[PDB]
Amino acid sequence: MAELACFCYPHLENDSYKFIPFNNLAIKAMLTAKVDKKDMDKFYDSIIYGIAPPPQFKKRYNTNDNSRGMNFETIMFTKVAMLICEALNSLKVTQANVSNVLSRVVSIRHLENLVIRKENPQDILFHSKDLLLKSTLIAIGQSKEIETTITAEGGEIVFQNAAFTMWKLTYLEHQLMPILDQNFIEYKVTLNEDKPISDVHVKELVAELRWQYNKFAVITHGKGHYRIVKYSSVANHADRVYATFKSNVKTGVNNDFNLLDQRIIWQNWYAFTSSMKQGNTLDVCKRLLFQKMKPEKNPFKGLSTDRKMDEVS
Amino acid sequence: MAELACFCYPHLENDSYKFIPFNNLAIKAMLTAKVDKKDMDKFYDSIIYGIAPPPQFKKRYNTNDNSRGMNFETIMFTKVAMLICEALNSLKVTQANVSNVLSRVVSIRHLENLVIRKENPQDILFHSKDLLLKSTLIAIGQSKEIETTITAEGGEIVFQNAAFTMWKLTYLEHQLMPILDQNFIEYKVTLNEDKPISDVHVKELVAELRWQYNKFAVITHGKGHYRIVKYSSVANHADRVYATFKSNVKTGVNNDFNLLDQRIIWQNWYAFTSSMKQGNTLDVCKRLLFQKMKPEKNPFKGLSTDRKMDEVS
Amino acid sequence: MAELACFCYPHLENDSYKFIPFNNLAIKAMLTAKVDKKDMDKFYDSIIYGIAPPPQFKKRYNTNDNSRGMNFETIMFTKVAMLICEALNSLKVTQANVSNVLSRVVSIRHLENLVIRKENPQDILFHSKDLLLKSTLIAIGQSKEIETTITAEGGEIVFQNAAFTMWKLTYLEHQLMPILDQNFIEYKVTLNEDKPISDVHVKELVAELRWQYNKFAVITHGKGHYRIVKYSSVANHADRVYATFKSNVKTGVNNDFNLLDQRIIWQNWYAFTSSMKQGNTLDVCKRLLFQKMKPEKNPFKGLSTDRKMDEVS
Amino acid sequence: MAELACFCYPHLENDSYKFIPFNNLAIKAMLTAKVDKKDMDKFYDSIIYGIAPPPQFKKRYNTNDNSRGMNFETIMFTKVAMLICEALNSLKVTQANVSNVLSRVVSIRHLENLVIRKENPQDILFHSKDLLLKSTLIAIGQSKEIETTITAEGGEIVFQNAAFTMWKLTYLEHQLMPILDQNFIEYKVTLNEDKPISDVHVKELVAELRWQYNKFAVITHGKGHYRIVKYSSVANHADRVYATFKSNVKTGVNNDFNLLDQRIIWQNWYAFTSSMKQGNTLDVCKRLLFQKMKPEKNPFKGLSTDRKMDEVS
Amino acid sequence: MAELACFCYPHLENDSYKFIPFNNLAIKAMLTAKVDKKDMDKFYDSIIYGIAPPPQFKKRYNTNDNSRGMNFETIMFTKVAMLICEALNSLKVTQANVSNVLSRVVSIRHLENLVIRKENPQDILFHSKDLLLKSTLIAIGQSKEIETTITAEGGEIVFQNAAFTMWKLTYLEHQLMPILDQNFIEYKVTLNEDKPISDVHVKELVAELRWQYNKFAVITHGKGHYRIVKYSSVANHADRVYATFKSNVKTGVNNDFNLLDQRIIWQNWYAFTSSMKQGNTLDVCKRLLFQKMKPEKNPFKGLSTDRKMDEVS
Amino acid sequence: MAELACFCYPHLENDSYKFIPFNNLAIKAMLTAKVDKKDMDKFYDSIIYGIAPPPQFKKRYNTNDNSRGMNFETIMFTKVAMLICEALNSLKVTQANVSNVLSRVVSIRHLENLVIRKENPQDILFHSKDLLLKSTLIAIGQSKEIETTITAEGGEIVFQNAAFTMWKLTYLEHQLMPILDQNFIEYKVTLNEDKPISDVHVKELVAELRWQYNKFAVITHGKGHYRIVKYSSVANHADRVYATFKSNVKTGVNNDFNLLDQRIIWQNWYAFTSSMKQGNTLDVCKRLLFQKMKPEKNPFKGLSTDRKMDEVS
């Protein structure tokens, strides 16, 4: 999780801002550099290895005294940086915008997964440059469009339906910036199409979720997909999405939040995010999260039995 | 799963039948031996490596043309054979009985797990020779007593309570006769004491079973413990326990069947075994196993919610 | 052993059905997919990884719960799929035929061996695209022609003559769908030319078979080659070829059966297949297979002595 | 194959000749020693590492310029030497005899196999010191007794009967003096008892020999066991046993030759050894070995069919 | 050491005999082939892997029962075969000659060393195709020219002078047909130029030979180079060169023998080869080889002292 | 090469000085210690790991900044230290003497080789504690006796005679203080007995030396054995033995020098040491070493021929 300015710098050629990747040794030089307090937000000249990121983003890079950043000396750093550049170079970014664009924080893991998609001959992104660009621009946050199956970050498909595709996020196996907590398990459910989903297809998804992923809560962060997370993590997710909601309200940036199908989402999460979306306080929202809520209409009552009896037969 | 006659032979010394283990090379010789059709049930003399098991049990031993038997050339074969001998030698078996005793089929895996217990300094069986003998004699089927926690076969303790202890059966990791199906997962729940168990302690067990082992059916084979098995296996278990029930009825051997706590056992399994115990046919019993049975009183209705909300908090 | 529909799907381009291989991740997605009972025979859209085989052929693919299928994630799967496509694309298959063609069950091992031939610079198939196509179309079952030495599946040549070539089938060493039984040994004897073979050349073949392969039965499945199989397997072969004979009779598909040279074939096998070809029952045929048949004229009486005395000299 | 004087030297203590093993470094020193032509048959004093064998046996030991001897630096050399000493020390050898005894050439491989027997807890020789001594004294050639199953050199039992035990000689796997020709295969058939063997038990042995070992000739070197050798080796065996016969005749040492059961032995071998035993020339004997001899009464005519049909059933 | 017919076969294309290498699997097939006694000298058709060498050269190829031949399945076999073809294809061999040319026995090791030369960018043969051809044609025996330094087989240069170059033959390290005797050490001394060599340069060579290679005899086989061989091998060399001399006399093929500088060659060898060249018998020649010949004029008397004193200083 | 005070310290118990080994961690502590200039010759107290050697011998121990010392952290350090203690403890050293005794410089490699001897069951030193003590006391320099074969330091015996034993010094393979120059080769020739040696036995030794070790000079350092050294080392040896001679003259310590057999020793070395022993200057002695000395009577003229001709035969 870091700024785009961690991967590339802008260069004005042909009266246009083309973005160029960093050499890892330039980053390595900057980390050893003595810079003025008033130059910490300026791009650094390594002399030998070209331009380097602003010294203020020192903590974004893993060193001996830091394991909270990314592994910039890997090959995947260059791949991700190239992906970012390719995407930004298509936008023809104006002089006023370059700073805002680069200061945008994005998911490095999302970008890494997109690299893993684009490089696989089997994946549609390998063949469609347009789909790759759409996918990347969503990840960059320079796109109004929603992440769907076609434009998903990726992972191992663990379930698929007419309406849905479930992915296991393999963040443990990443090169650039993995999850270090070995307990980490998280899935996501992307919609295949935006057109209306049937009751039968929703039933099929909820069936698999209640059977295979019973120890997981079904939530969302307001974009067009579900997040399958351990119940032990929900409280932290709540804090994050509320902080985001709060931040977007204060800064005036888009604050749309798709609560998604109420029959699929976890009751308490839907309550939480509904209160948040109504403009209630963190404590008001959080307190619903922990309430032993009176069981709603299921709304699919015989669903867990069906799969058991199928397995027996 | 094999006869005791696969591990030892009886020898009359000091006017008493002491049972002696087989050398693996004696077994190996017997497998290459040409024997008369009327000597197939007699113990075989290898000459060089001592007495060997009856040729009729050829298929009990793994060869090039057989992977359905045990690995008799391992060290654990000798350990198991020694355990058996030690147990049988304490009984002072009479001349009439020796044949019946040795023809008794027993769980080799059970015996292997008992070896793994007895050899560990941390385990009570290592220190109590009496407890070891009781445990082994249960496994041999030369004991009226019930297998409890103290006398359990063993495995990895995955849950423990005042009333119960849950073990993961590590049959995949065995040396002598492992499970070859890598999908194999099975647990057992042994009672710590026979005295009456509280509602609170039953609730605690059922809670863990509904949370951690939701894709598993809770059954029993009529002894004093629960078996936690995949729903995909229940149908096969049914066949086995019914065949056993049928066999014991025809042969007049003890046919006690403890159905165990109805609140813990899977509804369909309890129905199945109740019909069997009432003397109904296989088909009558089996048909209950597959019925989408109308949900009984839960009988613990808010139990699955409690653990979820705990995890969230 | 699987349908052609396990490797490719048809696509109508340029008013012609060109067959395209499957991506293994598409297959992998289908295996996790929830499909309607009435769509089980339709090709599956994985979205991300292209078209996938019909869900009804799930058991053709090896998973955690299945070791009876093929290893579709290997490189040889793609090679075999490509070979199939190349062959089918030459036929210009019509719209009515595509379903029948793809539903044809074929030997995957045969196809794998053809891949191993075509990729070796030393092998004639590497240089002759025509011979490769003929060979493959025989394996596919879209060819009236007989498998000979030139068009043989392959293996290690263990004996060769003017008339014959003996191959060891290395099915144990395969990647895509090996034989798992490590005891497996089987050879085949393909004819080099169809023109009449001399008594001297037949003698030479029968000599090697009686000397080197004395524990093997010489049979055929009715095509133009001999099969050298363990005597322990003959009974199973009998069942297979009879079932095939029966099936072809009922379905009206070609049911030619070349019994081959009576002097080479095992007496009991020739008796068996002659009875089958005369339209007798399975039991009638099988019973001949097990008869201690009165030794015919040898028909080469001093043959086993000759090779012994040669070896001594 | 070497003299006993290669392993030990005699020492007169307590008015008795006790034989002592050589240290390998003493042997190593002797190999580098400059000795007088008239001291080549005397035991060599290495000074540092004790007594060493006579320099005349230099070629018995493997060096850089010699791979025809034994590996005296191995542990098995010491084991074999100890076995020899133990045996010779029991005989109380007289002063006149010591030279003859030590100059006796013996099979090192035989002795090595006896070591492998005696050190295995499963083997009877491990427990019976008397049987071990008998076995060893046969191998040394200081015993009138015949090698039987009980006193056999050893190897892997590949077949066993009431009357017979077949051993695979694992001379390839030896440490001290292996066979270097990797094609080497040889078995031996020792009698379990000397009392008369039935027709049924002979049939059983001949059955296994015609089935499993069809490419092997059944011979003997005149002691009480059969030798199963490749047909390609028979001519060499003939030379050896004839040379021995010739040598024993000239030197007046015992020249008994047990031709063994005529129904079991290879026709040509029986002819050969019968001519030799009648006092005919090498050429006379050898010529019978190569004759395409008119097939005698089988004398078991349906034997090869029986096992085939059994395998099929 | 084998015939050229072991590596290639002739093919008449464009009214010219171009020679083509063998595929190793064709050779492998031929080794398993049953051929008529009157076809043993004809090239064999493997069908699948192209033409193969005449069956009469079976023993030239290493198998399970043969370690006296070459390793034809190696890559170096193909390299050597290609080298041979390249050379023979330049000669435009006539129809009458092809048989004689191919039946020529040549040093495989020589050819292998030439391959090792030609493939090294540092070696002149890599750049001069003419020099490579000259070198190869000498090795083939289709050239009147003498092997010199420029056209030498190769090896590790251990000494070099204005006049001479000494090579260590690394026959132990070969792939195709190595020396198996690990004691093997042999060097060769090729002349750099044919023009007359000074006394000073001869002195320098003889100095190094007396110092570094004192346990080696300096000989020749009559071509324009010296052979540095262990004194233990000289007797065998004598037999070989005499047999060659004898053979060439009987067959009328060129029988030139360059005795080389008498001051360099070993006294006894010069005597031997002089007697041979005068037409004396093997025994007459050999007897000189073993004579304790009265020391000639040294002819360099203080030479061994000089190098000692240099080393000291 | 270091003082005895590097291995042990004296302790006065029972009114006697018993010498005790150092713990390596005590040495390690001393190396890090800050000591007064006037305590550099006192034994150091490490507190935790006992007494340690005087800080003045710092350079005797290998550190990061020193590869000129010994590897004191090895096991062989303790073994050598123990050997030294065992030897010194037998002498009952007086209070006045302890300092002189411990300040004695000795060959660590000699001591290591004695350890390698004493620990080998095959070696006489393993069994004779008296011989071990004699050997060690010679190495320590607390013995008037001469090093002979029986009491030799050790190594690999490369030649042995009635009179002589040649050892290869394996100083490269040592643990405690090896030779680091990988070119190092040195042998020694110890006398087996002191009684007079024959001309024939001297001839045999000189023969092997002229044949196998022709590039080596035969010298001595004045004790009762020969040293076989490269001619390139002689000049350095000369310096050492002269410096020793000079030192012993100045300090009044024994200065016996056995020049040994003039027929065996290198002419120039004998000249050198004779001049030294006559009391000439270093330059006078050295100049003889480099003189191209007129060849004396050989004194064995046909010796080098004999071995050549033997090798040929």
Q: Which candidate in C63, C65, C184, C230 is best for mutational testing of the B interface (most B CBs within 10 A)? A: C65
Which of E11, E127, E201, E225 is catalytic? The answer is E225
Q: Is the dihedral of CA E241, E246, E248, E251 positive or negative?
A: negative
Strand stretches in F55-170, DSSP E? 105-106, 156-160, 164-168
Amino acid at A86: E
Angle, helices C199-212 vs C303-312, to 10°: value is 70
Q: Which residues in chain E touch residue F212, judged by CB atoms under 8 angstroms apart?
A: 215
| Side chain identity, residue B153 | E
Residue in F165, F207, F175, F171 with CA at minimum distance from that of residue F186: F171
CA-nearest residue of chain D to C306? D292
In this structure, are residues C260 and C220 in contact, taking their beta carbons and an 8 Å threshold? yes
How far apart CA C224 and CA C183 sit, in angstroms, is: 26
Q: Which residues of A266-294 are buried (b: 16+ CB within 10 A; e: fewer)?
A: bbbbbbbbbbbeeebeeeebbebbeeeee
Distance CA D53, CA D34 (A): 14
What is the distance between the alpha carbons of residues E195 and D52, in angstroms, rounded to a whole number? Answer: 59
Does E292 contact F305 at a Cβ distance shorter than 8 Å?
yes
Amino acid at A261: D
Residue with tokens 């289908």: C30
* Candidates A212, A232, A306; nearest CB to B311: A232
The whole-angstrom distance between A273's CA and the closest CA on chain B is 16
Q: How far is B16 from B10, CA to CA, in rounded Å? A: 9
Q: Name the DSSP class of E63.
A: B
Q: Which chains touch B (3 or more CB pairs under 8 A)?
A: A, C, D
Strand A51-52 relative to strand A44-45: parallel, antiparallel, unpaired? antiparallel
Those residues with Cβ within 8 angstroms of residue B76's Cβ, 6 or more apart along the chain or in another chain = B112, B115, B174, B175, B176
Of C81, C71, C25, whose CA–CA distance to C52 is shortest? C25
Q: Can the peptide bond before residue E196 be classed as cis, meaning omega within 30 degrees of 0? A: no
> How far is A57 from A2, CA to CA, in rounded Å?
9
Tokens of D134: 């008998």
Evaluate the CA torsion angle F20, F24, F26, F31 in order and state its sign: positive
The total of other beta-carbon atoms located within 10 Å of residue B66's CB is 13
Rounded to a whole number, what is the distance in Å from the CA of B67 to chain C's nearest CA? 10
Report the SS3 class of residue E187: strand
Q: Which residues, in sequence order, are CB contacts of C205 under 8 Å at separation 6+?
A: C159, C161, C163, C164, C166, C189, C264
Q: Which residue out of A119, A120, A122, A204 would a mutagenesis test of the C interface target, given it has the greatest number of C Cβ atoms within 10 Å?
A: A122
Coil, strand or helix at D51: strand
* Residue C26, min C-alpha distance to chain A (Å): 8
Q: In angstroms, rounded to a whole number, what is the distance separating the alpha carbons of residues C206 and C267? A: 13
DSSP 8-class letter at A78: H
Pair C54, C44: CB distance under 8 Å: yes
Rounded to 10 degrees, what is the CA torsion of D165, D169, D175, D177? 120
Residues of D with CB under 8 A from a CB of F: 23-26, 28-30, 32-34, 46-50
Give phi and psi for D86, each to the nearest 5.
-55, -45
What is the rounded CA–CA span in Å between residue E219 and residue E236? 12
**Contact assessment for residue E71 and residue E44, using Cβ atoms and an 8 Å cutoff:** no
* Chain breaks of chain C after residues with C–N above 2.5 Å: none
User: Pairing state of beta strands D105-106 and D51-52?
Assistant: unpaired
Token pair listed for C219: 């049979």
Helix (H/G/I), strand (E/B), else coil: F218? strand
Question: Subunits that touch chain A (at least 3 Cβ pairs < 8 angstroms)?
Answer: B, C
Q: Chain D: list its partners (3+ Cβ pairs within 8 Å).
A: B, C, E, F
| A-B Cβ pairs (cutoff 8 Å, strict) | 53
Q: Which residue pairs from E98-103 have beta carbons closer than 8 angstroms and sit at least 24 positions apart in sequence?
A: E98/E10, E98/E17, E101/E4, E101/E142, E102/E3, E102/E4, E102/E5, E102/E8, E102/E9, E102/E10, E103/E3, E103/E4, E103/E5
Element (H, E) at C218: strand C216-219
C225 is an active site residue: yes
Nearest CB among C122, C159, C192 relative to E25 is that of: C122
From C11, C110, C127, C225, the catalytic residue: C225
Residues D120 and D135: their CA atoms lie apart, in Å, by 15
CB contact under 8 A, A122 and C24: yes
3-class DSSP state of B173: helix
End-to-end CA gap in chain A? 47
**F311 contacts E232 by C-beta, under 8 angstroms:** yes
Q: Is the dihedral of CA F108, F113, F118, F124 positive or negative?
A: negative
Nearest CA in chain E to F234: E312
Which two structure tokens, joined as six digits, stand for D177?
A: 């003096």
Among D218, D217, D222, CA closest to D259: D222
State the best of E34, E36, E46, E78 to mutate against chain C, taking most chain C CBs within 10 Å.
Answer: E34
| Pairwise CA distance, residues E61 & E68, whole Å | 8
Instruction: Name the one residue in this structure whose structure tokens are 């075509």.
Output: C118
Q: Are E20 and E51 in contact (CB under 8 A)?
A: yes
- State the greatest distance between any 2 C-alpha atoms of chain E, in Å, as a whole number: 72
Q: What residue spans of chain B are helical by DSSP H?
A: 24-31, 75-89, 98-102, 108-118, 124-127, 129-140, 199-212, 234-251, 267-277, 282-289, 303-312
Question: B305: which 2 tokens?
Answer: 């919610």
User: Rounded to 5 degrees, what are φ and ψ at A144?
Assistant: -80, -15
Q: Helix (H, G, I), strand (E, B), or coil: what is residue B241?
A: helix
Helical residues (DSSP H) of E90-198, grouped into ranges? 98-102, 108-118, 124-127, 129-140
| C-alpha span between F142 and F139 (Å, rounded) | 8
CB neighbours of residue B234 within 10 Å? 24
CA angle A162, C39, C59 (to 5 degrees): 100
Q: Which of D11, D174, D201, D225 is catalytic?
A: D225
* Residues 6 or more apart whose Cβ sits within 8 Å of residue F251: none
If you search the block for the tokens 């191959």, which residue do you land on? C167
Chain A residue with Cα closest to B208: A215
Helix/strand/coil (H, E, C) string of C163-217?
A: CEEEEECCHHHCCCCCCCCCCCCEEEEEECCCCCCCHHHHHHHHHHHHHHCCCEE
CB within 8 Å: B290 and A268: no
Closest to F311 (Cα-Cα) out of F211, F161, F210, F205: F211
Q: Are C87 and C133 in contact (CB under 8 A)?
A: yes
Provide the token pair at C24. 């293994």
* Helix residue spans in D183-281 (DSSP H): 199-212, 234-251, 267-277
Q: Where is A187: in which H helix or E strand?
A: strand A186-191
Q: Which class for A84: exposed (0-12), middle (13-18), buried (19 or more C-beta within 10 A)?
A: buried
Sign of CA dihedral B4, B7, B9, B10: negative
Q: Is B11 annotated as a binding residue?
A: no
Q: Which residue has the tokens 């009114």?
A: F15
For tokens 């990791």, the residue is B173
What ranges make up the beta strands (E) of chain F? 2-3, 8-13, 16-21, 44-45, 51-52, 105-106, 156-160, 164-168, 186-191, 216-219, 225-230
D14: left (phi over 0), alpha (psi -120 to 50) or beta: left
For residue E159, the surrounding DSSP H or E stretch is strand E156-160
End-to-end CA distance of chain B: 47
- Residue E158 phi/psi, 5-degree rounding, is -105, -10
Identify which of A120, A124, A161 has the shortest CB distance to residue C34.
A161
Chains F and D touch (3+ CB pairs under 8 A): yes
Distance, CA of E176 to CA of E109 (rounded, Å): 8
| Cα–Cα distances in angstroms (integers) from residue C46 to residues A130, A140, A164, C23, C263, in the given order | 19, 26, 11, 10, 55
Give the C-alpha distances (Å, rounded to integers) separating B9 from B16, B36, C78, F140.
13, 20, 56, 67
- Give Dmax (Cα) for chain D: 72
Q: Which of A162, A21, D18, D297 lies closest to C47 in space, CA to CA?
A: A162
Angle between helices F75-89 and F108-118 (to 10 degrees): 90
Rounded Cα gap, residues C139 and C224, in angstroms = 13
Degrees to nearest 5, angle at CA C228 with C222 and C234 = 75
> Quick check: E288 and E234 in contact, CB under 8 A?
no
Q: Which residues of A touch C28 (CB under 8 A)?
A: 157
Token reading at E266: 């070993």
H/E stretch holding B11 reads: strand B8-13
A118-133: string of b/e by CB count within 10 Å (b at 16+)? bebebbbbeeeeebbb
Contact F259, F278 (CB under 8 A): no
| Residue B131 to chain D, least CA–CA distance (Å) | 31
B259 by DSSP, 3-state: which? coil
Give the tokens for residue F41. 């010759």
What's the CA gap between F64 and F69, in Å, rounded? 11
F227: Cβ contacts below 8 Å, ≥ 6 apart: F186, F187, F188, F189, F218, F219, F220, F221, F237
- CA quadruple C219, C221, C225, C229: dihedral positive or negative? negative
H or E, element range at A115: helix A108-118
Q: Give the burial string for E130-151 (b: 16+ CB within 10 Å, else e).
A: ebbbbbbbbbbebbeeebbbbb
Asked whether the beta carbons of A117 and A160 are under 8 A apart, the reply is no
Contacts of D208 (CB under 8 A, 6+ apart): B34, D159, D166
Residues of B carrying an active site annotation: 225
Contact assignment for F311 to E212 by CB distance below 8 Å: no
The H helix count followed by the E strand count for chain B is: 11, 11
How far does A268 lie from chain B, in Å, by closest CA? 10
- Interface with A, mutate which of B231, B232, B304, B305 (most A CBs under 10 A): B231
Token code pair at residue A312: 């027996």
Q: Report the DSSP beta bridge partners of residue B143.
A: none
d(C-alpha C87, C-alpha C118), whole Å = 13
D60 secondary structure, DSSP code: G
- The sign of the torsion formed by the CA atoms of A118, A123, A128, A131 equals negative
Q: From the CA atom positions of chain B, what is the Rg in Å?
A: 22
Residues of B with CB under 8 A from a CB of C: 64-65, 182-183
Q: Is D227 exposed, middle or buried (0-12, 13-18, 19+ CB in 10 A)?
A: buried
Out of C211, C289, C306, name the one closest to residue D312 (CB): C289
Q: Alpha-carbon distance D21 to D7, whole Å?
A: 6
CA B127 distance to own-chain centroid: 23
Q: Find chain D residues with C-beta within 8 A of B47's C-beta.
A: 124, 149-150, 160, 165, 192
F43: nearest Cα among F64, F13, F21? F21
How far, rounded to the nearest angstrom, does the alpha carbon of residue B108 sit from its chain's CA centroid? 8
- Inspect the structure and tell me whether chains A and C have 3 or more CB pairs less than 8 Å apart: yes
Residue F224 to residue F246: CA distance in whole angstroms? 20
Write out the two tokens for A217: 């809560």
Q: How far is E122 from chain F (nearest CA, A)?
A: 29
> Chains touching chain F at 3 or more Cβ pairs under 8 angstroms?
D, E
Tokens for F89, please give them.
Answer: 């403890």
Six-digit token string for C313: 């000299």
The closest alpha carbon to A309, from B41, E187, B268, belongs to B268
Paired tokens of D235: 């001519």
Q: How far apart are the first and last CA of chain F?
A: 47
Q: How far apart are CA C82 and CA C90, in angstroms?
A: 13
- Residues, chain F, total? 313
B119: exposed, middle or buried (Cβ count in 10 Å: 0-12, 13-18, 19+): exposed
Q: Pick out the residues of the known binding site of E.
A: 107-109, 188, 221-223, 227
Please judge whether D235 and C313 are an interchain contact, meaning their C-beta atoms are less than 8 angstroms apart: yes
D183 vs E64, E182, E183: nearest CB: E64
Q: Which residue of D has its CA nearest to E181?
A: D65
Given a contact cutoff of 8 angstroms between Cβ atoms, the answer to whether A117 and A136 are in contact is: no
d(CA C250, CA E85): 60
Order of strands across the sheet with F225-230? F156-160, F164-168, F186-191, F225-230, F216-219
B285: nearest Cα among B254, B233, B245, B230: B245
Please say whether the beta carbons of D84 and D140 come within 8 A.
Answer: yes
Domain ranges, ordered by start, for chain E: 1-145, 152-312
In chain E, how many H helices and how many E strands? Answer: 11, 11
Contact E277, E257 (CB under 8 A): yes
